[PDB]
Amino acid sequence: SRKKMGLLVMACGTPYKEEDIERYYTHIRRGRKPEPEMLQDLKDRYEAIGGISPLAQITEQQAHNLEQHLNEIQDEITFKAYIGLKHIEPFIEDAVAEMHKDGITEAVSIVLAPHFSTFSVQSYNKRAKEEAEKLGGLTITSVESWYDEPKFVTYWVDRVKETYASMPEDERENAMLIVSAHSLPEKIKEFGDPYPDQLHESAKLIAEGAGVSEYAVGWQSEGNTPDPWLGPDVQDLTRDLFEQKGYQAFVYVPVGFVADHLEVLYDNDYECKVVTDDIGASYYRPEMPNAKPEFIDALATVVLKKLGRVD
Numbered sequence: 001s002r003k004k005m006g007l008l009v010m011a012c013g014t015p016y017k018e019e020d021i022e023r024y025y026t027h028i029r030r031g032r033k034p035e036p037e038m039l040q041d042l043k044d045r046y047e048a049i050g051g052i053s054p055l056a057q058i059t060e061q062q063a064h065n066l067e068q069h070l071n072e073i074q075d076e077i078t079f080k081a082y083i084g085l086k087h088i089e090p091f092i093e094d095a096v097a098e099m100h101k102d103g104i105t106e107a108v109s110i111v112l113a114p115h116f117s118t119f120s121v122q123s124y125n126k127r128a129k130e131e132a133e134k135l136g137g138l139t140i141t142s143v144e145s146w147y148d149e150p151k152f153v154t155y156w157v158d159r160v161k162e163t164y165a166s167m168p169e170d171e172r173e174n175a176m177l178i179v180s181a182h183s184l185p186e187k188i189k190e191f192g193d194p195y196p197d198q199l200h201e202s203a204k205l206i207a208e209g210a211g212v213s214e215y216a217v218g219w220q221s222e223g224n225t226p227d228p229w230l231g232p233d234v235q236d237l238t239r240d241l242f243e244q245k246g247y248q249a250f251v252y253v254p255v256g257f258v259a260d261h262l263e264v265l266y267d268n269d270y271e272c273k274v275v276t277d278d279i280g281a282s283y284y285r286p287e288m289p290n291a292k293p294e295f296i297d298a299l300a301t302v303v304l305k306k307l308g309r310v311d
């Protein structure tokens with residue numbers, strides 16, 4: 001009969017309603033409650049992007065669709081998905097405890113961010129494993145990165161091809177592709193963290209597959225701490241490249257992100273769009289993966305490869 005496995009799907013998390021913003025951002029800010037002006041600003045940003053409720057729904061849909069798709073495409077394992085989040089319930093440790101309570105003894109985990117880093121992916125995986133160890137009798141094998149899964153590369157390659165094909169001739173000959181991920185503190189370098197190298201490799205692979213010769217790599221959405229974060233930031237990079245070469249279209253591929261959350265809908269589609277509007281360039285940002293079948297199939301392949309059950 002089929003082996004039962006937990007499928008632990010991990011992510012940063014998102015507020016579920018406007019009244020969750022305070023606690024969610026306090027958590028991101030390591031216990032520092034946002035001041036009233038910042039709370040109001042954040043509410044306004046979420047209103048501007050179309051509201052909060054759709055956001056956590058994406059992550060739930062990704063986990064649910066991944067469970068169902070994994071269960072349909074092979075006949076050896078029955079997976080049950082559990083969501084574990086960093087900054088709001090259900091927390092990672094809660095998800096692991098629920099797996100253990102439900103009788104799961106063997107699980108596979110994946111983080112909804114394709115590049116490994118010490119700051120996020122490794123920390124999530126270690127937290128999950130540490131909770132399993134505390135409870136006993138449950139083991140987890142963890143996906144560490146998946147940016148190089150061919151099906152995932154192809155998702156973005158094909159979105160980029162469609163965007164370039166849609167352009168007027170003058171833009172298609174004078175466009176710049178900006179490939180980005182969430183900035184992290186530069187000090188990850190002290191550990192040899194491969195996160196920057198992996199973003200650069202994503203960009204190489206996507207530009208190569210799409211036949212785009214002119215591209216650049218940037219970072220976005222840095223936090224506010226006294227130590228430096230990876231740069232350049234996409235807003236600065238856009239303006240600098242425009243000053244250097246006069247590109248008249250910018251195409252943003254925020255490959256580090258998997259969903260229509262604040263980082264994409266605001267930090268690209270508002271903040272980068274301010275810059276492109278200021279310089280007179282066209283703005284393009286192809287569809288994020290969200291829970292679409294092509295992306296879910298890529299993730300299912302990642303999981304089955306991690307378990308050795310497909311070549």
Ligand SMILES: [Cl-]
Nearest residue numbers: 116144145194
């Ligand atoms: Cl890795």
Ligand SMILES: [Mg+2]
Nearest residue numbers: 017018019020
């Ligand atoms: Mg209300």
Ligand SMILES: [Mg+2]
Nearest residue numbers: 037038041042
């Ligand atoms: Mg402001």
Ligand SMILES: [Mg+2]
Nearest residue numbers: 144145146148
């Ligand atoms: Mg690998």
Ligand SMILES: [Mg+2]
Nearest residue numbers: 220221222267
């Ligand atoms: Mg910002």
Ligand SMILES: [Mg+2]
Nearest residue numbers: 225226227228
């Ligand atoms: Mg600084």
